[PDB]
């Protein structure tokens, strides 16, 4: 009766109100704390992302076949039991699938029978007792799976994952405070294009990566390296396009990474950098950099060799002026100089019209120039300049900046 | 009472607004999980695609004669019982019967009296115990079966299909990861115009494809292939005009790919290709060169030889620069060039008058050339480029471009 009441209670009109848009401009429905699943939810064909969160006693009716745009279904803490015609429909229609659970209790069985899906995101503790990678032994039949994010506090790499990966393309590893035992088993699996390692507390980058020549995006965030004698061994790999080593504790970055001109992204913010020598910056074509919250006394000169920048950061450190070497660069769009001690502002940095988003709030500048008055490109919603001296700025400068907040 | 209630819930005026249009611009009526098939549906006189999906145990009444435009009878999972005058109506009238199914009772036992059938796709697994293809042993009775699309997961090509093959022309065998062991059974089949071994896990192209002399449209999608060395034997086929090679694992191409001058729509996309030979441009009839999402480091210049080329799509490659003689082609209709690592577009793109959609979202374009506004047929909607990169155009030039957009 409650399920029948839910259908009449949730009208299509009320549901259309609940539809929002996600990052991909796709229509998402957030079903939050519903005792059942309304058939009116499957009535509305405009849905794309079906977020059903902590919904118990789920029996997904095949009226979902009438829903047209469904490529995402977000199963959070749900014991799902789908019907066979719905199985047939989602085998040809669904394209991504996120699953959150508490061990075997909320892991569903119909997920394996769907063999055409691309994205299979698994959330919840899979490191359960007495079930050491034996539940996921039924993943072998999946040959179309290319994106597989594994965030389940895994202890070891499953051998079944090694068997299945032959047709994989994207893989992400999140351990949230657990030392993974990789044991160099990645030599088998060659097709992999994107690999990520977040907060593994390793300090020792494995060797099986170098046998793979297809990795373009490598994310090693919060790995806390201190002496990277690995970027002399990363010279073996000639596919990595953007290294992501941010929120580490790098004491000094070893110079050899200067030889990879294909590097385009230097994420190194919130670090313990004391001095970083020059030859790091022999690569010219780096766009995004982040160096916030450091102890650097001067930004090294051969960053001046970098001519293809888009973002930097001098946040919360002991740098008082922008060197002429940084003025040899011509592509400073974004920066992060807020809550800092920058004193002198020359005309070279100020004439950079394409300044996209520079943090400057809390900076210890002396006075702000009248060069923030006229042009319709560099303005407040772009550049958040220090508001203590924005008051002493002329009202026409404030006109440009408030124009940013309007235009 | 059931039919009266059914008609009351879904009256002719109710389904009049429900009248929708399909891809073929024929009127369609998606009847889904409805208790019976209504007579108010039949009161229409121009429905061409009767979409009968999951309607359990219903007798089609004589009122179906009102559907004068009914060419395609889409029977999906529907237990359909029908009377003798309408069986005769089927043997003399119906030209297309598009069947999705799961059971040999869902497929009806009165379509083998049907004779005027000219189009049909079967969708649904057919591998069953003691009841294989005795269902469609009336294919021999079906003397006009030219279109036979099979998303039916057949483990082997039926021999009754071969005996039909005197008039069979299109065989889209989407086996969903099952190999079609042709075993030169298509050697007997000397009259085909098309063959599509889609997702059939070949890894080796059979000789039954080459042995013919009437094939025109060959589509080998997702076969995990490595080498295409066998096209020297393709010179026997004098009518091949298209090879859509979608989603394969090809490491490299040989040079003899240039031999097939008869090729028009040569697809080589979603591959691991690192080198395209100059010999490849020996072909002169190439019309649809879709090289989307590839590993091509640069567009070769000799591609200017293709004077019939209309839709050249090279999105998401690693293409650095565009050579000049690339722009010798003027018949280009859809240049999808996005997600590249291109630094700039040469001014010869302003020479393009047929420029309708050029995808520049990405690349490294400092400023758009003004000549992009010169293209008359190009409107602002067709100019797929980032707004920040787009905004460099002059004010009255933007006024003319917006005038073209609103016209």
UniProtKB/Swiss-Prot annotation, chains A, B:
First-listed, main subcellular location of the protein, grouped into a coarse class: membrane
Species this protein is from: Mus musculus (Mouse)
Biological process terms in GO annotation: aspartate transmembrane transport; cell volume homeostasis; chloride transmembrane transport; cyclic-GMP-AMP transmembrane import across plasma membrane; intracellular glucose homeostasis; monoatomic anion transmembrane transport; monoatomic anion transport; positive regulation of insulin secretion
From-to range in the entire protein, with total length: 402 to 808 of 810
Related illness: Defects in Lrrc8a are the cause of ebouriffe (ebo), a spontaneous mutation that causes male sterility. Spermatozoa present in the epididymis display severe malformations, mostly of the tail. A drastic decrease of the spermatid population is observed, whereas spermatogonia and spermatocytes seem moderately affected. Defects are caused by decreased volume-regulated anion channel (VRAC) activity in germ cells. Oogenesis is not affected but embryos derived from ebo/ebo females show early developmental failure.
Annotated catalysed reactions: chloride(in) = chloride(out); iodide(out) = iodide(in); taurine(out) = taurine(in); L-aspartate(out) = L-aspartate(in)
Entry comment, domain topic: The volume-regulated anion channel (VRAC) channel forms a trimer of dimers, with symmetry mismatch between the pore-forming domain and the cytosolic LRR repeats, a topology similar to gap junction proteins.
The protein's assembly and partners: Heterohexamer; oligomerizes with other LRRC8 proteins (LRRC8B, LRRC8C, LRRC8D and/or LRRC8E) to form a heterohexamer. Can form homohexamers in vitro, but these have lower conductance than heterohexamers. In vivo, the subunit composition may depend primarily on expression levels, and heterooligomeric channels containing various proportions of the different LRRC8 proteins may coexist. Interact with GRB2. Interacts with NOX4; this interaction prevents the ubiquitin-mediated degradation of LRRC8A.
Protein name: Volume-regulated anion channel subunit LRRC8A
Knocked-out gene: effects: Increased prenatal and postnatal mortality, growth retardation, and multiple tissue abnormalities. B-cell development is slightly impaired, without affecting B-cell function. Mice however show a cell-autonomous early block in thymocyte development and impairs peripheral T-cell expansion and function. Conditional deletion in germ cells leads to abnormal sperm and male infertility: the cytoplasm of late spermatids appears swollen, preventing reduction of the cytoplasm during further development into spermatozoa.
Keyword annotations: Acetylation, Cell membrane, Differentiation, Disulfide bond, Glycoprotein, Ion channel, Ion transport, Leucine-rich repeat, Lysosome, Membrane, Phosphoprotein, Repeat, Spermatogenesis, Transmembrane, Transmembrane helix, Transport
Placement of sequence motif Di-leucine motif: 305-306
Regulation: Inhibited by (4-[(2-butyl-6,7-dichloro-2-cyclopentyl-2,3-dihydro-1-oxo-1H-inden-5-yl)oxy]butanoic acid), which plugs the channel like a cork in a bottle by binding in the extracellular selectivity filter and sterically occluding ion conduction. Lipids may block conduction in closed heterohexameric channels.
First and last residues of every LRR repeat: 10-21, 22-44, 46-67, 68-91, 92-114, 117-141, 142-164, 166-188, 189-212, 213-236, 238-260, 261-283, 285-306, 307-329, 331-352, 353-375, 377-400
Topological domain ranges for the Cytoplasmic compartment: 1-407
């Amino acid at each position: 009766l409650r399920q029948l009441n839910l259908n009449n209670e949730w009208t299509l009109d009320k549901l259309r109100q609940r539809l929002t848009k996600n990052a991909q401009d796709k229509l998402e429905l957030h079903l939050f704390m519903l005792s059942g699943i309304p058939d009116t939810v499957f009535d509305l064909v405009e849905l794309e992302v079906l977020k059903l969160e902590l919904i118990p006693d789920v029996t997904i009716p095949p009226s979902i076949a009438q829903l047209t745009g469904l490529k995402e279904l977000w199963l959070y803490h749900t014991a799902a039991k789908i019907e066979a015609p719905a199985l047939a429909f989602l085998r040809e229609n669904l394209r991504a699938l996120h699953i959150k659970f508490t061990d075997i209790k909320e892991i569903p069985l119909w997920i394996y029978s769907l063999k055409t899906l691309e994205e299979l995101h698994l959330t919840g503790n899979l490191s359960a007792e007495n079930n050491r990678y034996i539940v996921i032994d039924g993943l072998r039949e999946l040959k179309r799976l290319k994106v597989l994010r594994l965030k389940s506090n895994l202890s070891k790499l499953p051998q079944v994952v090694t068997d299945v990966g032959v047709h994989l393309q994207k893989l992400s590893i999140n351990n949230e405070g657990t030392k993974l035992i990789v044991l160099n088993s990645l030599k088998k699996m060659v097709n992999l294009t994107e690999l990520e390692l977040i907060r593994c507390d390793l300090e020792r980058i494995p060797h099986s990566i170098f046998s793979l020549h297809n990795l373009q995006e490598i994310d090693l965030k919060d790995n806390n390296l201190k002496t990277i004698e690995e970027i002399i061994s990363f010279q073996h790999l000639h596919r990595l396009t953007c290294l992501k080593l941010w929120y580490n504790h790098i004491a000094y970055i070893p110079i050899q990474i200067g030889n990879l001109t294909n590097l385009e992204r230097l994420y190194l913010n919130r670090n313990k950098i004391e001095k970083i020598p020059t030859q790091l910056f022999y690569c010219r074509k780096l766009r995004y950099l982040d160096l916030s919250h450091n102890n650097l006394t001067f930004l090294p000169a051969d960053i001046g060799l970098l001519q293809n920048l888009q973002n930097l950061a001098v946040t919360a450190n002991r740098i008082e002026a922008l060197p002429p070497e940084l003025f040899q660069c011509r592509k400073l769009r974004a920066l992060h100089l807020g809550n800092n001690v920058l004193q002198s502002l020359p005309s070279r940095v100020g004439e950079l019209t394409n300044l996209t988003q520079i943090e400057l709030r809390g900076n210890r500048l002396e006075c702000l120039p009248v060069e923030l008055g006229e042009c319709p490109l560099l303005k407040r919603s772009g550049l958040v300049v220090e508001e203590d001296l924005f008051s002493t700025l002329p009202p026409e400068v404030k006109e440009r900046l408030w124009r940013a907040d309007k235009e």
